[PDB]
Structure formats: C-alpha cells, structure tokens
Amino acid sequence: MPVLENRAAQGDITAPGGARRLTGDQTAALRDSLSDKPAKNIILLIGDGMGDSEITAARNYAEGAGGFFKGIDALPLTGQYTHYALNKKTGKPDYVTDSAASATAWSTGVKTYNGALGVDIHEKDHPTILEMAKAAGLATGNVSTAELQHATPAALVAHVTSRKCYGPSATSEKCPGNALEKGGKGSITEQLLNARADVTLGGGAKTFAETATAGEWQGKTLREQAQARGYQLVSDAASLNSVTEANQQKPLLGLFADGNMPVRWLGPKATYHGNIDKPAVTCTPNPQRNDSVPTLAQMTDKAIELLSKNEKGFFLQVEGASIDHQDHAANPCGQIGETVDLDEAVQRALEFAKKEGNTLVIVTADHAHASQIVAPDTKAPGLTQALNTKDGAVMVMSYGNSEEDSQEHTGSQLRIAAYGPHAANVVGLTDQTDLFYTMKAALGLK
C-alpha cells in the first residue's frame, strides 16, 4: 500500500502543466490502496479545528501554494464527513458542534449535545473505542498537546454531562451526578486515572494538584493517587525518553505543562484592517518551546514505540490541539505553526504504518473553524492579517464570525483522509459517527 510520495506542483507554475500535482493515471495506485483485511493497529490523528481552510492556509504559508504536506497531504484515500451535534432538548440537529460532542461522536458512535463527554442526549454512558480496545487486550494511547482534561483526549476515557467538570472541585458544582462524593464515577481527571490507558501524554499538570473528595484516595492529590496506583510519571523529554515499558502494570502518564503545551510559532494577533494598516508578518519560532519539552512528533514516536510491544496491537489517538485555540485567538502564526506541528506527527505515523503494513492511519478534524483566505486588498469587518509566505508573496487571512473575544467554529463538512486496511470507509460523504464503526470493524473489535 503506497502513500503519495509527492503531490507538489511538478514544475514552473507559470507554464502549461507546470502546476500539475499528478504525473500519470492514478487508477492503479488507488487499486493498491484498497484492502479489507483486519487492521492490527490504528493511529487516529486529530487536528482540532483543522478544516480544509486551515490546511490550505498552512500549506500556502509553510510549503507554498504549489507545495505539499509530507504528512497531512500524503494520505491516498480522501473524503468529507459531517459533524453536526444535537440540541439536548429537542433531539434536532445543532449545525455547529463543540469539541466535546464531536469527540464523543467518533469515540462512541452516538451523536450528543454540545458540552457532553461520553454520554448521549439522555446523559447515558456509552463505551469508547479506547475502553473497547483495552477490553479486547490491545495497547492504548492517548496523546495531545492540550491539557488532558480537554474535550478531545478526555472523550476517550471520561463520561460526564459537561466538559467543564475537570477535577473534583468543578465536578461537584457542575456535574452533581458524576461527583465522586455523590456516588458518581468522578471528574474527567479521576476517570482518566481509572480508565488506565497504557500511554497518556499531554499537559494540564495543574489540575492533578487537586485533592479527591472521596474514595480510597480522599485527601490525596490526583498526582499522588496516580503514583499510588502504579502510574509512572514523566514531566520532561529526557525522562520520557528513559521510559522503556508502558503497559497495564506500569502505565505511563506524561505531564509536560501546567496547562496546554507551548505553541510552536509566535506572531501577533489578527486585527481590524490589519492587511491594510499593518505590515506583512513573518512568524517566528517560540523561544520557550524548549528542548526539554517533547514535540508532538516526539510524543507520537514514543507512544508508537511503547504501544508496539503489545502483540495484540494498539489504538493511539494523537491530537494537534492548539490549532483550535489559536484559531479562536485569531492568531495566524499560532494556528499555522500547530498545523505544521501536526504534519510532523502524521509523518511519523505514516512511516511506521508503511513498514508495519497492517496499520490504519486516519487524519482529520473534529469540526471546521473561522479562518478564511481572502484577497490582499480585502476590507473586512473582522480581524485580518497579511503574511509573508514561502512563495515570497502575501496571503491575507480573515476571521469575522464573531465580534466577541473568541472566533467561532463553523459547520462546514471537512476532509478526512486515511491509509491502510479499511481506509476506503472514509471516501465520499460519511458522518463522524461512522468513524467509530470504521475503527471498531477495522480492529475487529468485539
């Protein structure tokens, strides 16, 4: 099964055939990309808010319009999927989902309301693909650049009526029925610890400082509970690299930041008439991204290495989180840098998947976002910014779907690409909940 080695402009963009990405008929290559045998492993790469627009903006800036993302764009089977949520009261569709309801849709196969994690509109729990993979004996991984309490990673291990129920404190107040001291299963964090994935890497070390309100570990900080339960904790890249075992007996919990991990690129925020009144921006790397902080690609590589020791196979979800945050923040450079960041991780996954031959890799996003690529001389009512792309030309990005502090999500259907056994199931129009069924069947999960 081949991966598109190169879909970049073949030559001089100004000449006939120069901007072509294909070099011949693709029929045969596509025939070789189709396989229905079981998938032994599954790596799900999620770019939060990485719609088609976000991918194009990132490509234009970092690789050039005629460029090609060695990871994101290398997947052969492509399609578009819907991610509408449901209104809790009416059961009718809610065209623009949040990160919680969408994550639940692909992790459980059931639609839900905005803000929900692992439960339907009737607040009923549903087993996640991770819980199922684990029950079947497969190694499980949950990686992300955001706080592990964040919607995307949480959705695979917690079941709460509200994404806001991070630790004991918030839970008791906002999620009474889930409150441990009220007979519930506990907060997102407490449930994360219970779920016991083999590898869990992300940020949000601050929340682990809270103390449990009940149970065996009442009075103990969640960090202490983690230690007492057998979790091997790592907080930097050096220690992460020293890890050799990651199993049910010695599960790994990496906390590399108080909150979300540092953004890769710095750049100013978009501004009213920014492409007109202000000079073009060139993004600069974040001096604080550190050498002590592992990159998304590094975390992915480690998770793969450790999870691959399991004879049964593994399920790994990797999230390029900050694309969504920086999109909300209307910060082009942050948004793009996180997309480039994700690309690298996709590459690692594709490299392993190609050698192993029985790995289904899927790259997609939970929902679309605000950013739009508009003409240079655009006078928009929102925030805009002009950037100096790799092409030596200027690209203007716009965010104008909110007068408030944060730019909002959008409902547009978006790309989903895959590679390996059962990838055909992402082609054409599909729903986000179909992804749950695709992964479960590919893994023969039962």
Catalytic residue ranges:
99
Name the pairing type of β-strands 414-419 and 359-364: antiparallel
Q: What DSSP state is assigned to residue 415?
A: E
Q: Which does 111 bind (CB under 5 to 8 A by kind): Zn ion, a second copy, none?
A: a second copy
Which positions from 229 through 268 interact with a second copy, judged by CB under 8 A? none
Among 1, 19, 214, 280, contact with a second copy (rule: CB under 8 A): 19
Q: Which is nearer to Zn ion, 410 or 430 (CB)?
A: 410
Helix (H, G, I), strand (E, B) or coil at 418: strand
Locate tokens 């940020």: which residue? 203
Q: Is 200 in the site for a second copy (CB under 8 A)?
A: no
Which positions from 375 through 434 interact with a second copy, judged by CB under 8 A? 375, 378-382, 389, 391-393, 395-396, 398, 400-404, 408-415, 417, 422, 424-425, 427-434
Contact, 281 vs 269, CB < 8 A?
A: no
Residue ranges of alpha helices (H) inside 280-331 are 296-307, 322-328
Locate tokens 């978006």: which residue? 414
Q: Which is nearer to a second copy, 30 or 243 (CB)?
A: 30
Q: Is 135 in the site for a second copy (CB under 8 A)?
A: no
Q: For residue 203, what are its two tokens? A: 């940020």
At closest approach, how far in Å is the CB of 410 from a second copy? Answer: 5
Closest CA to 208 of 184, 227, 236, 195: 227
Q: Is 60 in the site for a second copy (CB under 8 A)?
A: yes
Q: What is the CA radius of gyration of the chain?
A: 21
- Count of residues in the chain: 446
Task: State the amino acid at position 151 in one-letter form.
Answer: A
At closest approach, how far in Å is the CB of 108 from a second copy? Answer: 7
Q: Which does 80 bind (CB under 5 to 8 A by kind): a second copy, Zn ion, none?
A: a second copy
Q: In whole angstroms, give the CA distance from residue 68 to residue 74.
A: 8
Among 80, 221, 232, 239, contact with a second copy (rule: CB under 8 A): 80
Name the pairing type of β-strands 394-399 and 383-388: antiparallel
Name the pairing type of β-strands 41-47 and 359-364: parallel
Q: For residue 243, what are its two tokens? A: 């890890």
At closest approach, how far in Å is the CB of 109 from a second copy? Answer: 5
Residues that bind Zn ion (CB under 5 A): 48, 99, 152, 321, 324, 366
Q: Which does 324 bind (CB under 5 to 8 A by kind): a second copy, Zn ion, none?
A: Zn ion
Among 42, 44, 100, 121, contact with a second copy (rule: CB under 8 A): 121
What mask of x and - would describe binding to a second copy in positions 298 to 337, judged by CB under 8 A? ----------------------------------------
At closest approach, how far in Å is the CB of 114 from Zn ion? Answer: 11
Contact, 198 vs 141, CB < 8 A?
A: yes
Nearest-CB residue for Zn ion: 99
Q: Is 176 in the site for a second copy (CB under 8 A)?
A: no
Q: Is 13 in the site for a second copy (CB under 8 A)?
A: yes
Strands (E), 49-174: 77-82, 85-86, 93-94, 139-147
Q: What Cα–Cα distance (Å) separates residue 185 from each residue in 25, 141, 327?
A: 55, 21, 33
Q: Is 276 in the site for a second copy (CB under 8 A)?
A: no
CA 435 to chain CA centroid, nearest Å: 14
What mask of x and - would describe binding to a second copy in positions 33 to 52, judged by CB under 8 A? -xxx--------------xx
Q: Which does 431 bind (CB under 5 to 8 A by kind): Zn ion, a second copy, none?
A: a second copy
Q: In whole angstroms, give the CA distance from residue 99 to residue 152.
A: 6
Among 27, 242, 244, 249, contact with a second copy (rule: CB under 8 A): 27
Q: Which does 321 bind (CB under 5 to 8 A by kind): a second copy, Zn ion, none?
A: Zn ion
Q: Which is nearer to Zn ion, 152 or 410 (CB)?
A: 152
